[PDB]
Design a protein around this motif. Structure first.
Motif, PDB file in Angstrom:
ATOM      1  N   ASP A 130       3.666  -4.391  -0.242  1.00 49.72           N
ATOM      2  CA  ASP A 130       3.215  -3.363  -1.177  1.00 49.72           C
ATOM      3  C   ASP A 130       2.405  -2.304  -0.443  1.00 49.72           C
ATOM      4  O   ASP A 130       1.194  -2.461  -0.303  1.00 49.72           O
ATOM      5  CB  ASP A 130       2.376  -4.007  -2.275  1.00 49.72           C
ATOM      6  CG  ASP A 130       2.047  -3.072  -3.406  1.00 49.72           C
ATOM      7  OD1 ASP A 130       2.369  -1.868  -3.333  1.00 49.72           O
ATOM      8  OD2 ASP A 130       1.452  -3.572  -4.392  1.00 49.72           O
ATOM      9  N   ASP A 156      -4.106  -1.126  -1.051  1.00 52.92           N
ATOM     10  CA  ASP A 156      -4.986  -1.138   0.118  1.00 52.92           C
ATOM     11  C   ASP A 156      -5.222  -2.572   0.590  1.00 52.92           C
ATOM     12  O   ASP A 156      -5.387  -2.832   1.796  1.00 52.92           O
ATOM     13  CB  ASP A 156      -6.345  -0.490  -0.186  1.00 52.92           C
ATOM     14  CG  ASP A 156      -6.253   0.900  -0.775  1.00 52.92           C
ATOM     15  OD1 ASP A 156      -5.257   1.626  -0.583  1.00 52.92           O
ATOM     16  OD2 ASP A 156      -7.254   1.293  -1.423  1.00 52.92           O
ATOM     17  N   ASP A 157      -5.303  -3.514  -0.363  1.00 50.61           N
ATOM     18  CA  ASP A 157      -5.775  -4.867  -0.112  1.00 50.61           C
ATOM     19  C   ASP A 157      -4.730  -5.882  -0.577  1.00 50.61           C
ATOM     20  O   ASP A 157      -3.908  -5.598  -1.451  1.00 50.61           O
ATOM     21  CB  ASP A 157      -7.094  -5.162  -0.828  1.00 50.61           C
ATOM     22  CG  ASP A 157      -8.153  -4.102  -0.581  1.00 50.61           C
ATOM     23  OD1 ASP A 157      -8.489  -3.852   0.596  1.00 50.61           O
ATOM     24  OD2 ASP A 157      -8.643  -3.515  -1.569  1.00 50.61           O
ATOM     25  N   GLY A 164      -9.601  -2.708  -8.667  1.00 54.30           N
ATOM     26  CA  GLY A 164      -8.979  -1.968  -9.744  1.00 54.30           C
ATOM     27  C   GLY A 164      -7.517  -1.708  -9.444  1.00 54.30           C
ATOM     28  O   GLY A 164      -7.124  -1.521  -8.288  1.00 54.30           O
ATOM     29  N   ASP A 178       5.161   3.883  -2.550  1.00 60.22           N
ATOM     30  CA  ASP A 178       4.713   2.554  -2.951  1.00 60.22           C
ATOM     31  C   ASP A 178       5.880   1.585  -3.126  1.00 60.22           C
ATOM     32  O   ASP A 178       6.564   1.572  -4.164  1.00 60.22           O
ATOM     33  CB  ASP A 178       3.879   2.666  -4.228  1.00 60.22           C
ATOM     34  CG  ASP A 178       3.185   1.392  -4.597  1.00 60.22           C
ATOM     35  OD1 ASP A 178       3.398   0.353  -3.917  1.00 60.22           O
ATOM     36  OD2 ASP A 178       2.408   1.434  -5.601  1.00 60.22           O
ATOM     37  N   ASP A 190       9.085   1.306 -10.452  1.00 64.62           N
ATOM     38  CA  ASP A 190       9.329   2.598 -11.065  1.00 64.62           C
ATOM     39  C   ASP A 190       8.315   3.619 -10.563  1.00 64.62           C
ATOM     40  O   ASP A 190       7.302   3.279  -9.949  1.00 64.62           O
ATOM     41  CB  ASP A 190       9.238   2.509 -12.599  1.00 64.62           C
ATOM     42  CG  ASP A 190      10.116   1.413 -13.173  1.00 64.62           C
ATOM     43  OD1 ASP A 190      11.285   1.307 -12.750  1.00 64.62           O
ATOM     44  OD2 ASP A 190       9.629   0.654 -14.044  1.00 64.62           O
ATOM     45  N   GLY A 208       2.883  -2.493 -16.600  1.00 69.74           N
ATOM     46  CA  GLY A 208       1.775  -3.370 -16.294  1.00 69.74           C
ATOM     47  C   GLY A 208       1.539  -3.501 -14.801  1.00 69.74           C
ATOM     48  O   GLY A 208       2.465  -3.389 -13.993  1.00 69.74           O
TER      49      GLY A 208
HETATM   50  C1  LIG Z   1      -8.268   6.221  -8.427  1.00 67.78           C
HETATM   51  C2  LIG Z   1      -7.950   4.792  -8.098  1.00 67.78           C
HETATM   52  O1  LIG Z   1      -8.428   4.040  -9.129  1.00 67.78           O
HETATM   53  P1  LIG Z   1      -8.362   2.461  -9.031  1.00 67.78           P
HETATM   54  O2  LIG Z   1      -8.999   1.967  -7.875  1.00 67.78           O
HETATM   55  C3  LIG Z   1      -6.540   2.039  -9.028  1.00 67.78           C
HETATM   56  O3  LIG Z   1      -5.808   2.948  -8.294  1.00 67.78           O
HETATM   57  C4  LIG Z   1      -4.468   2.460  -8.091  1.00 67.78           C
HETATM   58  C5  LIG Z   1      -3.604   1.863  -9.143  1.00 67.78           C
HETATM   59  C6  LIG Z   1      -2.195   1.392  -8.793  1.00 67.78           C
HETATM   60  C7  LIG Z   1      -1.649   1.492  -7.353  1.00 67.78           C
HETATM   61  C8  LIG Z   1      -0.252   0.982  -6.997  1.00 67.78           C
HETATM   62  C9  LIG Z   1      -0.361  -0.547  -7.048  1.00 67.78           C
HETATM   63  N1  LIG Z   1      -1.445  -0.950  -6.200  1.00 67.78           N
HETATM   64  C10 LIG Z   1      -2.478  -1.900  -6.577  1.00 67.78           C
HETATM   65  O4  LIG Z   1      -2.663  -2.329  -7.631  1.00 67.78           O
HETATM   66  O5  LIG Z   1      -3.268  -2.245  -5.469  1.00 67.78           O
HETATM   67  C11 LIG Z   1      -4.514  -2.978  -5.654  1.00 67.78           C
HETATM   68  C12 LIG Z   1      -4.683  -3.809  -4.708  1.00 67.78           C
HETATM   69  O6  LIG Z   1      -5.269  -2.931  -3.478  1.00 67.78           O
HETATM   70  C13 LIG Z   1      -5.989  -2.027  -3.998  1.00 67.78           C
HETATM   71  O7  LIG Z   1      -5.613  -0.597  -3.510  1.00 67.78           O
HETATM   72  C14 LIG Z   1      -5.109   0.129  -4.419  1.00 67.78           C
HETATM   73  C15 LIG Z   1      -5.357  -0.690  -5.777  1.00 67.78           C
HETATM   74  C16 LIG Z   1      -5.679  -1.978  -5.475  1.00 67.78           C
HETATM   75  C17 LIG Z   1       0.920  -1.207  -6.574  1.00 67.78           C
HETATM   76  O8  LIG Z   1       1.233  -0.696  -5.379  1.00 67.78           O
HETATM   77  C18 LIG Z   1       2.044  -0.962  -7.617  1.00 67.78           C
HETATM   78  N2  LIG Z   1       1.730  -1.747  -8.804  1.00 67.78           N
HETATM   79  C19 LIG Z   1       2.525  -2.925  -9.029  1.00 67.78           C
HETATM   80  C20 LIG Z   1       1.916  -4.132  -8.228  1.00 67.78           C
HETATM   81  C21 LIG Z   1       2.901  -5.336  -8.360  1.00 67.78           C
HETATM   82  C22 LIG Z   1       0.539  -4.505  -8.769  1.00 67.78           C
HETATM   83  S1  LIG Z   1       1.411  -0.815 -10.174  1.00 67.78           S
HETATM   84  O9  LIG Z   1       0.754   0.559  -9.828  1.00 67.78           O
HETATM   85  O10 LIG Z   1       0.604  -1.741 -11.056  1.00 67.78           O
HETATM   86  C23 LIG Z   1       2.975  -0.432 -10.876  1.00 67.78           C
HETATM   87  C24 LIG Z   1       3.672   0.810 -10.431  1.00 67.78           C
HETATM   88  C25 LIG Z   1       5.005   1.096 -11.071  1.00 67.78           C
HETATM   89  C26 LIG Z   1       5.626   0.086 -12.048  1.00 67.78           C
HETATM   90  N3  LIG Z   1       6.944   0.132 -12.802  1.00 67.78           N
HETATM   91  C27 LIG Z   1       6.969  -1.026 -13.638  1.00 67.78           C
HETATM   92  S2  LIG Z   1       5.731  -1.854 -13.504  1.00 67.78           S
HETATM   93  C28 LIG Z   1       4.926  -1.091 -12.484  1.00 67.78           C
HETATM   94  C29 LIG Z   1       3.567  -1.386 -11.856  1.00 67.78           C
HETATM   95  C30 LIG Z   1      -2.505   2.061  -6.304  1.00 67.78           C
HETATM   96  C31 LIG Z   1      -3.890   2.539  -6.715  1.00 67.78           C
HETATM   97  O11 LIG Z   1      -8.961   1.706 -10.284  1.00 67.78           O
HETATM   98  C32 LIG Z   1      -9.030   2.457 -11.470  1.00 67.78           C
HETATM   99  C33 LIG Z   1      -9.563   1.543 -12.563  1.00 67.78           C
END
Ligand SMILES: CCOP(=O)(COc1ccc(C[C@H](NC(=O)O[C@H]2CO[C@H]3OCC[C@H]32)[C@H](O)CN(CC(C)C)S(=O)(=O)c2ccc3ncsc3c2)cc1)OCC
Lengths: 99, 99
Positions: A25, A29-30, A48, B25, B30, B48
């Protein structure tokens, strides 16, 4: 190897002596794994994602093997929907994106 | 190009006539973009991840240019914290993972 993205980039990892499936992924970041028993000390942390924040256990300097490539680094354990390998470990195995 | 993962893989994209920064990513099935008022029809959807779900609007056959490479597909628009380019579009520009 060269991994295309028509299917989810799922690989087998070895951690704490056990095999698991995990998602490579580049948007994480983590590294965040589903609830599991890991040996060693840990500290509470928050991370988050797209839908908000979750509480995780932060384990430092953990050995993990990803397709037979060894990494040693931080692993977060908590209620993630799926085991994800983030950039902190992808960089250790020499992963890059190319197009 | 080759993109290393020391830093978050952010690139410039062109969508609906506008330029934006977005995350390449491999963990996203999606493509999810920040709130924007794109013309045309759309369908509601819930996606989600870590922290739960968000409500998004699903637009079909949307053209995006990603660092000069063009792609056409589904784009989800909602209150995401960052613009995310997912595998549905990454495949089209022929992006692979390599380690
Ligand atoms: C301003 C920042 O605000 P923020 O910190 C949060 O920002 C963010 C939010 C989301 C992402 C991308 C996700 N990364 C992630 O969760 O990584 C975490 C672990 O490492 C850390 O680094 C970054 C976040 C921490 C993943 O790559 C992709 N995801 C799926 C996986 C399996 C979980 S998806 O986005 O859920 C997603 C996308 C399309 C899709 N189509 C159908 S389902 C579906 C689900 C990067 C940064 O908190 C705010 C409260």
């Amino acid at each position: 190897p060269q991994i295309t993205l028509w299917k989810r980039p799922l690989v087998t990892i070895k951690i704490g002596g056990q095999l698991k499936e995990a998602l490579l992924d580049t948007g994480a970041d983590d590294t965040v794994l589903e609830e599991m028993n890991l040996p060693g000390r840990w500290k509470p942390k928050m991370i988050g994602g797209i839908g908000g924040f979750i509480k995780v256990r932060q384990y430092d300097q953990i050995l993990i093997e990803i397709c037979g490539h060894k990494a040693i680094g931080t692993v977060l354990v908590g209620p993630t929907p799926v085991n994800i390998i983030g950039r902190n470990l992808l960089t250790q195995i020499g992963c890059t994106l190319n197009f």
